[PDB]
């Protein structure tokens, strides 16, 4: 489930394969994040690594501060547009795919998160829940 995550993770429908671009939901100055790798991904021929809500990816900043650009950093997905099933009894989805920039220990670079944050991601990552103002 990755280093820094709080416990095990149940399966969520994958919406972001490698090569996807998502928004940046923190206040570190990055505008978008380009997914190049998914942490904890398995191995199968011809299959692209994909990430869901609450996953950690390796991303490069495409738009934002030039100091943040041209570097690879860990990110945590906090919103996805692909619908997924909650065990309470509903399928649901967000407007956009959005992630936040973090460290290998799962600590946010920014100080706050704009927009809603998924319940699964907030429960899996304590620092995301600490920096979230809206949790679903």
Partner 1 sequence: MGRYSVKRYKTKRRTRDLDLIYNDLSTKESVQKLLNQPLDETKPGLGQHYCIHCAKYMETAIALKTHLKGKVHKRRVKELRGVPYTQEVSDAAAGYNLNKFLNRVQEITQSVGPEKESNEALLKEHLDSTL
Partner 2 sequence: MRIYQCHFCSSPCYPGHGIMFVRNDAKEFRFCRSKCHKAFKQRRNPRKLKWTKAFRKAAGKELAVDSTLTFAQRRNVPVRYNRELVATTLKAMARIEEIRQKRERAFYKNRMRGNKEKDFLRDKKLVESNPELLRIREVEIARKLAKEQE
Partner 3 sequence: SHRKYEAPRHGHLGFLPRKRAASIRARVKAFPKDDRSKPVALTSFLGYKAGMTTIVRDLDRPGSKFHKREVVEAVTVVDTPPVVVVGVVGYVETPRGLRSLTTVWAEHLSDEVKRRFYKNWYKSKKKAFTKYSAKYAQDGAGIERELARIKKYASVVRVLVHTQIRKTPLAQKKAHLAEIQLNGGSISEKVDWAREHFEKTVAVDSVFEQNEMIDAIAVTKGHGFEGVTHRWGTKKLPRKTHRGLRKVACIGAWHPAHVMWSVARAGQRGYHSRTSINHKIYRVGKGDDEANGATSFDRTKKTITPMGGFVHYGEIKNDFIMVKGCIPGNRKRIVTLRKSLYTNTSRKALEEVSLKWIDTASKFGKGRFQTPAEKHAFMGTLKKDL
Partner RNA sequence: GUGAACAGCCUCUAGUUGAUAGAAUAAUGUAGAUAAGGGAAGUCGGCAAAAUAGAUCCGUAACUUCGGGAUAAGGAUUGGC
Partner RNA sequence: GAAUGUUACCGCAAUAGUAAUUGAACUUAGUACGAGAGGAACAGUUCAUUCGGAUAAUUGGUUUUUGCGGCUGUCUGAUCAGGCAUUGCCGCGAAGCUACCAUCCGCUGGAUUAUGGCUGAACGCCUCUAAGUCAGAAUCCAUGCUAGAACGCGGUGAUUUC
Partner RNA sequence: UGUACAACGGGGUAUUGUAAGCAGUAGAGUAGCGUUACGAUCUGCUGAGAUUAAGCCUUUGUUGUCUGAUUUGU
The residues of the shown chain that bind Mg ion, judged by CB under 5 A, are: 46
The span from the CA of 98 to the CA of 76, in Å, is 9
Positions 82 through 111 that interact with partner 3 (CB under 8 A): 87-89
Positions 58 through 97 that interact with partner 1 (CB under 8 A): 81, 93, 95-96
The span from the CA of 109 to the CA of 40, in Å, is 21
Burial class (CB in 10 A: 0-12, 13-18, 19+), 26: buried
Per CB under 8 A, does 112 bind partner 2?
no
Binding-residue total with partner 3 (CB under 8 A) = 9
The span from the CA of 18 to the CA of 58, in Å, is 10
Per CB under 7 A, does 106 bind RNA?
no
For residues 50 and 108, which CB has a smaller minimum distance to RNA in the complex?
Answer: 50
Nearest CA to 33 out of 67, 61, 69 is that of 61
Local structure of 96: helix, strand or coil? coil
42, 46, 66, 70: residue in contact with partner 3 (rule CB under 8 A): 46
17, 21, 65, 83: residue in contact with partner 2 (rule CB under 8 A): 83
Per CB under 8 A, does 36 bind partner 1?
no
Per CB under 8 A, does 11 bind partner 3?
no
């Amino acid at each position: 489930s990755g280093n820094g995550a709080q416990g095990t993770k149940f399966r969520i429908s994958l919406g972001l394969p490698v090569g996807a671009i998502m928004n940046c939901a923190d206040n570190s100055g990055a505008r978008n994040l380009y997914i190049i790798a998914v942490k904890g991904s398995g191995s199968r021929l011809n299959r692209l690594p994909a990430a869901s809500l609450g996953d950690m990816v390796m991303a490069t900043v495409k738009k934002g501060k030039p100091e943040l650009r041209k570097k690879v950093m860990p990110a945590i997905v906090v919103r996805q547009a692909k619908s997924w099933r909650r065990r309470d009894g509903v399928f649901l989805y967000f407007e956009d795919n959005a992630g936040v920039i973090a460290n290998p220990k799962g600590e946010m670079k920014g100080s706050a998160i704009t927009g809603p944050v998924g319940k699964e991601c907030a429960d899996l990552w304590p620092r995301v829940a600490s920096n979230s103002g809206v949790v679903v």
